[PDB]
Design a protein around this ligand. Structure first.
Ligand SMILES: *[C@@H]1O[C@H](CO)[C@@H](O)[C@H](O)[C@H]1NC(C)=O
Ligand SMILES: *[C@@H]1O[C@H](CO)[C@@H](O)[C@H](O)[C@H]1NC(C)=O
Length: 531
């Protein structure tokens, strides 16, 4: 100490930290990156619930992002920014339980509302250090205290032998919870208000948020919640204990392995070997399905998310939820024949029927025909453009839009204050093809205010747009109302089903979140599948 920037030295429960002055377009922010919050979940701790980080001595340097949790690395389009932006940007390691904090510079004088980000990536990938999660803009422009944590994904985070001691399941979610607890105890040191904590996340991050809402021990740890393009209910975010057990033992076999001994063998395997077989345990050929996700353990999750939302009391809850215009397009190039980023992906009626079986992998023959019947345009049954887009809609509706619809409806019917949106602006910088429209994941860069960074080549209108969204999100975190005390954003209600469009145009209000089609997925399909 002595000749150091006095405004970057901070103490937390575990010890002393030195952070970094970062440049944002409109001025400096304080960043504290790679703060450990758990004991490394390595060796005999693999598959185990996280234990809190033991205090250290000296000044921990907190000026760079820490390791990314060990994970699958995408290879579909090597070199292509559209896929690479989501790939790990620091060394892969099982020792990865660290978190990040951005705050105004100098730090806030009064207690500031805290946003906590939880990244998505199907519960098998992701990292808080990605460029699209850069907190400097929300910190600098809105004066937010922003926190984001790494959590274990894949087998390391979610492989479960339900009931066992050595692999209880959901430890990735416990990593998240431990970091929420860390914020409660320590965020005041940075000027953050522990009594105003809003969770937000996208895709599996969104599902994670939803699960914290549904799990009592997390409830005391936050006050409001944003769920972007993801839900804890729906077909991909959880598996039953039986299915978890089945996938865990299959994967053990594949790598050469009484729960205790099985798990102990798994713990002897190099991280990379587990990753190399993680995609080989899915029950059917599929897209938008992930091998190791939260399990219904009857503990963290006392029952299925469907049951928990259908019956829970949510009077104290304020939630913001929404979707992008083309939730499904992204996923089609990852396993539906006929789809590519490199061409128009016009497909035949045959490819559409085949796409449906892969897109709705759990459907019986009858259920799948119902899907094809509903989505077919009977004026143009064979039109390759309609079919391409209908395949997208099937995947988007089944996995995101309708699970979101069910969530908003149940939450509202049961006391929560809900705001709902659809994001419809396509980044002028998007590198995916036009046919994909506004794909899943591509609102995030706007919510975090990347267009304010002049070197990123967004349009002036995109810059203004981003600022608006930053205002909505931070207003909602601040007050539980996106609106600024300009057209208004009404709550979503069972009776009016109102939501807003988010684009370059001023807020426009709409009614019914795919009401008709979602009745099919949410009300009819369940009944049909039995049997
Ligand atoms: C686009 O690419 C995919 C995969 O290479 C291919 O199957 C399909 O035939 C192509 N579409 C057209 C109409 O050229
Ligand atoms: C932005 O535009 C300039 C000028 O064309 C270009 O040289 C630069 O690489 C661009 N940056 C990005 C990331 O698009």
């Amino acid at each position: 100490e002595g000749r150091e920037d006095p405004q970057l030295l901070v103490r937390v429960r575990g010890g002393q930290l030195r952070g970094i002055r970062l440049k944002a377009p409109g001025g400096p922010v304080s960043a504290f990156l790679g703060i450990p919050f758990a004991e490394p979940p390595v060796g005999s701790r693999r598959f185990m619930p996280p234990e809190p980080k033991r205090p250290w001595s000296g000044v921990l340097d907190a000026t760079t992002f820490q390791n990314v949790c060990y994970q699958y690395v995408d290879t579909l389009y090597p070199g292509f920014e559209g896929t690479e932006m989501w790939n790990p940007n620091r060394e892969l390691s099982e020792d990865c339980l660290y978190l990040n904090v951005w705050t105004p510079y100098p730090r806030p004088a009064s207690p500031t509302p805290v946003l906590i980000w939880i990244y998505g990536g199907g519960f098998y990938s992701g990292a808080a250090s990605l460029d699209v999660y850069d907190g400097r803009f929300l910190a600098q422009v809105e004066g937010a205290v922003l926190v984001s944590m790494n959590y274990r994904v894949g087998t390391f985070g979610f492989l479960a032998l339900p009931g066992s001691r050595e692999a209880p399941g959901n430890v990735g979610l416990l990593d998240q919870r431990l970091a929420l607890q860390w914020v409660q105890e320590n965020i005041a040191a940075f000027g953050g208000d522990p009594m105003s904590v809003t969770l937000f996340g996208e895709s599996a991050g969104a599902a994670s948020v939803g699960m914290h809402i549904l799990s009592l021990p997390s409830r005391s740890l936050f006050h409001r919640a944003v769920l972007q393009s993801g839900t804890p209910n729906g077909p991909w975010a959880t598996v039953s204990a039986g299915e978890a057990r089945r996938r865990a033992t299959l994967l053990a076999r594949l790598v050469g392995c009484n729960d205790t001994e099985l798990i102990a063998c798994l713990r002897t395997r190099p991280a990379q070997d587990l990753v190399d077989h993680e995609w080989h345990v899915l029950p059917q050929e599929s897209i938008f399905r992930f091998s190791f996700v939260p399990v219904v353990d009857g503990d963290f999750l006392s029952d299925t998310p469907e049951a928990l939302i259908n019956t829970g009391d949510f009077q104290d809850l304020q939630v913001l939820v929404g979707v992008v215009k083309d939730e499904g397009s992204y996923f089609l190039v990852y396993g539906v024949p006929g789809f590519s980023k490199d061409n128009e992906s016009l497909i035949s009626r045959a490819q559409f029927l085949a796409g449906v079986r892969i897109g709705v992998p759990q459907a019986s023959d009858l259920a799948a025909e119902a899907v094809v019947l509903h989505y077919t345009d009977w004026l143009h049954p064979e039109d390759p453009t309609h079919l391409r887009d209908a395949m997208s809609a099937v995947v988007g509706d089944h996995n995101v839009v309708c699970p979101v619809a069910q969530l908003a409806g149940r939450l509202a019917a049961q006391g929560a204050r809900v705001y709902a949106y659809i994001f419809e602006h396509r980044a002028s910088t998007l590198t995916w093809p036009l046919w994909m429209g506004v794909p899943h994941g591509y609102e995030i860069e706007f919510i975090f205010g990347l267009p304010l960074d002049p070197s990123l080549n967004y349009t002036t209108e995109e810059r203004i747009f981003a600022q608006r969204l930053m205002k909505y999100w931070t207003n909602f975190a601040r007050t539980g109302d996106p609106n600024d005390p300009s057209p208004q954003w009404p709550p979503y209600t069972t009776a009016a089903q109102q939501y807003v469009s988010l684009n370059l145009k001023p807020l426009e209000v709409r009614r019914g979140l795919r009401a008709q089609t979602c009745a099919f997925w949410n009300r009819f399909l369940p009944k049909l599948l039995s049997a």
